[PDB]
Design a protein around this ligand. Structure first.
Ligand code: CLA
Ligand code: CLA
Ligand code: CLA
Ligand code: CLA
Ligand code: CLA
Ligand code: CLA
Ligand code: CLA
Ligand SMILES: CCCCCCCCCCCCCCCCCC(=O)OC[C@H](CO[C@@H]1O[C@H](CO)[C@H](O)[C@H](O)[C@H]1O)OC(=O)CCCCCCCCCCCCCCCCC
Ligand code: KC2
Ligand SMILES: CC1=C(C#C/C(C)=C/C=C/C(C)=C/C=C/C=C(C)/C=C/C=C(C)/C=C/[C@@]23O[C@]2(C)C[C@@H](O)CC3(C)C)C(C)(C)C[C@H](O)C1
Ligand SMILES: CCCCCCCCCCCCO[C@H]1O[C@H](CO)[C@@H](O[C@H]2O[C@H](CO)[C@@H](O)[C@H](O)[C@H]2O)[C@H](O)[C@H]1O
Lengths: 140, 154, 25, 173
């Protein structure tokens, strides 16, 4: 155990891994959170630049939550994410080997180096998105 | 799935057109074909829906523009909403892809294979190609409509 | 179905004999 | 086995619905062909009844006697009977329907002696029809289902339209 995607720091202290199934669940959650956070970083970046059709009025920042078009957009995004996460989507993850959705787009390899890069970039994106959101809600 | 030229979607113009090679193993191809058939059918019906809705409407939906902005009318929104529930009933229920025996095979509810058709490769290819053409079209009709406000007629 | 899935077969879906599981959970 | 092997029990939603609570089919086997002919007649009359309940609002026949805009499902028949006997467009329709019906006597004999269970309701029209026997059976089940639905729908539409004055398509107050 503890020999999968642990660069430059080895195993994190006070790790909650426990048994193999617990570590599998934790890795699934970690990769999911990373991927979301990476997505959120990119969404904020692109929203600061361009807006959807019929979406120019709504604020580019967090304010889209309580605006009318932004509210409907967020609700439908949540519904689609539910469709994707409940398993209804054909590309669904293997119960073992979490974070592997079968590679929908044949982008390429699945090497340990690629897994480490994905996980670490998600790790950065976590802090990036959290800091951005905190800064916005705090300053204004 | 070493070869797929015998699959319904080969067609003469471009046999097994797949430069990016997204689906090359039987499982990936089955999933992609289920998605393609669903998209094609949805498009075939969206396109005809536009065409008919322009010159026809149900009682109580008279005010609806019948075009891209049809969702604006509250009655049309309630109708889209009931259609969404019915489509969910079909999807999670009768026409669920997981329960499907083959990609896009939902059991032939009405025996078109028995009458005025057959479950032949020719008809599968016909369905696939019509779905592609309807797909490309709805995008065109809807987009052209947005750029230049017009109805389906074009 | 599967040997594990049979532990509850006959108690689901519109008719009892079905096994409704579109997500394949 | 059931009825006389007639179409109308197979190809249901779940495959083999055999609807006969009151055992008319078993009690009167000699009348099964008559029952099938009557069911098909009622269904094919109800289909056209619904379509002719809808269409008149959009269109009216060319002759200058049905052009009144107040000829709803309620007043149409009584108004169109007209004066005396054998003078109205309703009478023209009755005579046309009788002429059509008389051919069934040619087909199945004068007294429906030849009316069997495998030819009940079959008037020999085979245009735009399935080539295969299975396809023909499937289309017969479609026809039976559509006819039963149209019978129930025309009954409900007429009852509702008269009860609440909604003589047009919604048929709801
Ligand atoms: C988890 C990530 C995430 C989340 C939660 C959201 C959430 C939202 N996005 Mg999206 N967005 C994302 C990633 C994300 N985005 C990414 C990766 C991109 C680029 C690929 C975009 C590009 C984008 C645009 C261009 C717009 C939105 C907008 C919106 C809002 C309406 C949704 C809609 O109409 O569709 C909603 C708050 C709309 C909005 O109101 O922005 C202010 C809008 O115009 N998003
Ligand atoms: C609704 C989307 C959709 C989907 C899921 C598929 C799926 C498929 N197509 Mg494709 N196809 C589509 C739309 C789609 N097609 C359209 C609109 C056209 C018309 C140009 C074609 C024309 C076409 C041909 C000519 C052929 C295929 C074939 C295939 C198969 C292999 C390629 C593949 O997996 O691509 C999946 C790729 C994606 C889902 C990503 C799309 C990326 C962007 C969005 C597209 C550009 C915009 C697979 C079943 C081959 C086949 O049938 O082999 C037997 C084949 O020869 N397709
Ligand atoms: C309550 C109703 C309902 C339900 C339960 C479902 C359920 C389903 N639909 Mg959907 N669908 C619905 C209404 C519904 N649909 C309606 C009203 C339509 C239009 C008439 C469609 C059209 C549709 C299509 C065309 C497809 C589905 C697919 C699916 C499956 C995947 C859903 C998912 O994760 O999307 C997740 C959604 C997203 C990730 C959003 C992506 C959108 C952008 C534009 C993609 C760009 C690339 C699932 C069985 C897919 C399927 O079965 O594939 C095999 C599929 O291809 N649906
Ligand atoms: C606590 C909820 C719950 C749980 C644990 C289960 C569990 C089960 N159901 Mg399911 N079921 C539920 C609720 C639930 N059901 C409800 C409410 C319905 C009515 C639609 C059904 C209808 C149903 C049928 C018809 C059948 C089953 C069957 C099964 C079994 C196999 C399928 C499966 O993997 O289900 C696992 C289910 C889940 C993990 C639930 C996932 C829910 C997702 C995340 C969506 C939730 C969103 C929801 C709409 C709430 C939104 C609220 C928000 C807007 C505020 C399994 C024991 C099958 C069976 O017993 O076969 C013998 C079967 O045939 N169920
Ligand atoms: C008045 C019209 C009418 C007539 C003449 C028939 C006649 C028939 N139906 Mg019935 N049927 C009707 C209306 C009618 N149906 C309607 C409205 C429905 C929809 C609910 C059905 C649904 C139905 C099903 C699902 C089935 C039949 C079947 C039958 C056949 C066997 C039962 C029998 O002996 O009934 C005799 C009926 C009467 C003498 C009419 C009495 C009406 C009341 C009591 C007055 C027979 C040819 C069975 C069949 O086709 O088997 C091959 C069969 O499975 N029917
Ligand atoms: C089978 C049932 C049925 C019945 C009982 C009637 C009865 C009637 N129709 Mg007809 N009609 C039917 C089916 C039926 N229709 C169908 C299927 C259509 C569609 C083509 C029409 C279309 C139609 C029109 C357009 C008109 C009628 C009209 C009439 C009336 C005069 C009939 C006449 O002179 O016919 C001549 C042969 C009468 C109330 C007239 C009327 O006054 O309606 C209120 C009229 O203008 N009908
Ligand atoms: C099979 C077709 C069919 C359909 C689709 C309908 C549909 C309807 N009927 Mg029904 N109805 C039918 C056959 C049908 N009927 C038949 C054969 C009859 C004759 C007995 C009736 C007699 C009837 C009456 C007398 C009334 C309805 C009413 C209604 C409406 C409300 C029913 C409800 O939900 O009550 C829930 C309680 C609804 C539009 C009610 C209404 O208001 O209609 C406008 C009503 O009062 N129907
Ligand atoms: C309506 C009742 C129809 C009954 C019927 O026809 O049943 C018939 C069908 C089942 O049909 C049977 O299925 C079996 C499957 O093995 C059989 O093999 C056959 O396919 C078929 O006979 O059932 C349904 O249609 C059930 C659908 C019920 C709707 C479920 C709603 C769940 C929606 C949540 C989706 C996730 C999104 C969350 C977003 C919100 C959160 C913010
Ligand atoms: C005692 C049990 C019982 C009751 C009390 C009952 C009541 C009602 C009511 C009123 C409340 C209505 C309005 C109604 C309507 C329909 N019933 Mg139903 N029904 C019962 C039993 C069966 C069986 C066994 C079958 C069946 C069917 C159909 C079909 C579709 C036919 C088709 O399309 O083939 C329709 C429209 C057949 C089927 O296939 O349904 C998908 C079928 O096999 N029913 N049924
Ligand atoms: C619950 C159940 C079932 C059931 C059922 C039940 C209870 C069914 C009931 C059906 C019922 C009760 C059906 C009435 C029809 C009435 C009609 C056609 C009336 C026509 C009336 C006409 C054509 C009148 C015409 C005119 O008067 C007009 C309009 C104006 C006048 O100037 C002129 C004339 C006189 C010409 C299933 C589905 C069978 C099986 C399932 O398993 C269980
Ligand atoms: C904003 C946050 C909203 C949160 C909404 C919460 C919705 C209600 C909770 C849903 C939890 C569902 O959990 C349940 O279905 C998941 C669907 O992937 C399963 O998911 C897991 O197991 C299944 C095994 O085949 C498959 O779905 C996947 O391979 C695996 O990831 C979980 O094993 C199960 O416990």
């Amino acid at each position: 155990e503890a020999g999968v995607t642990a660069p430059l720091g080895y195993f994190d202290p006070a790790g909650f891994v426990q048994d193999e199934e617990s570590f599998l669940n934790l890795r699934r959650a970690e990769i999911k959170h990373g991927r979301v956070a990476m997505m959120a970083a990119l969404g904020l970046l692109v929203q600061s630049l361009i807006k959807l059709p019929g979406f120019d009025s709504v604020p580019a920042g967090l304010g889209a939550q309580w605006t009318a078009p932004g509210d409907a957009g967020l609700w439908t995004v949540v519904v689609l994410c539910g469709f994707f996460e409940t398993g209804l989507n054909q590309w669904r993850e293997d119960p073992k080997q979490p974070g592997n959705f079968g590679d929908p787009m044949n982008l390429g390899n699945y090497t340990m180096e690629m897994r480490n890069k994905e996980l670490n970039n998600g790790r950065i994106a976590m802090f990036a998105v959290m800091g951005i959101i905190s800064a916005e809600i705090y300053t204004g | 799935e070493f070869n797929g030229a015998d699959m319904p979607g080969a067609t003469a113009p471009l046999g097994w057109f797949d430069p990016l090679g997204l689906g090359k193993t039987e499982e990936r191809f089955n999933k992609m074909r289920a998605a393609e058939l669903k998209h094609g059918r949805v498009a075939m019906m969206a396109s005809l829906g536009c065409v008919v809705q322009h010159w026809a409407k149900f009682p109580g939906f008279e005010s609806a523009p019948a075009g891209l902005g049809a969702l604006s009318n509250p009655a049309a929104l309630g109708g889209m909403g009931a259609l969404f529930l019915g489509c969910g009933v079909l999807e999670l229920g009768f026409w669920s892809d997981e329960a499907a025996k083959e990609p896009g095979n939902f059991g032939d509810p009405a025996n078109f294979s028995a009458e005025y058709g057959a479950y032949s490769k020719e008809f599968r290819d016909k369905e696939i190609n019509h779905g592609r053409m309807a797909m490309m079209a709805i995008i065109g009709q809807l987009s052209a409509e947005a750029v230049t406000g017009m109805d389906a007629a074009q | 179905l599967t040997p594990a899935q049979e532990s509850i077969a006959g108690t689901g879906g519109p008719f009892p004999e079905n096994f409704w599981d579109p997500a394949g959970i | 086995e059931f009825a006389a092997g007639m179409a109308g029990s197979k190809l249901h939603g779940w495959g083999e619905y055999q609807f006969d609570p009151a055992g008319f089919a078993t009690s009167y086997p000699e009348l099964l062909g008559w029952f099938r002919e009557s069911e098909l007649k009622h269904g094919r009359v109800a289909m056209l009844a619904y379509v002719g309940l809808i269409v008149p609002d959009a269109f009216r026949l060319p002759f200058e006697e049905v052009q009144d805009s107040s000829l709803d499902l309620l007043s149409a028949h009584n108004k169109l009977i007209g004066p005396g006997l054998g003078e109205g467009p309703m009478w023209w329709l009755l005579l046309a329907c009788g002429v059509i019906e008389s051919f069934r006597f040619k087909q199945v004999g004068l007294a429906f002696e030849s009316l069997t269970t495998e030819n009940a309701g079959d008037l020999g029209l085979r245009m735009f029809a399935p080539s295969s026997a299975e396809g023909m059976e499937s289309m017969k089940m479609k026809e039976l289902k559509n006819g039963r639905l149209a019978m129930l729908a025309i009954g409900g539409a007429l009852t509702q339209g008269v009860l609440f004055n909604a003589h047009h398509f919604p048929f709801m107050s």
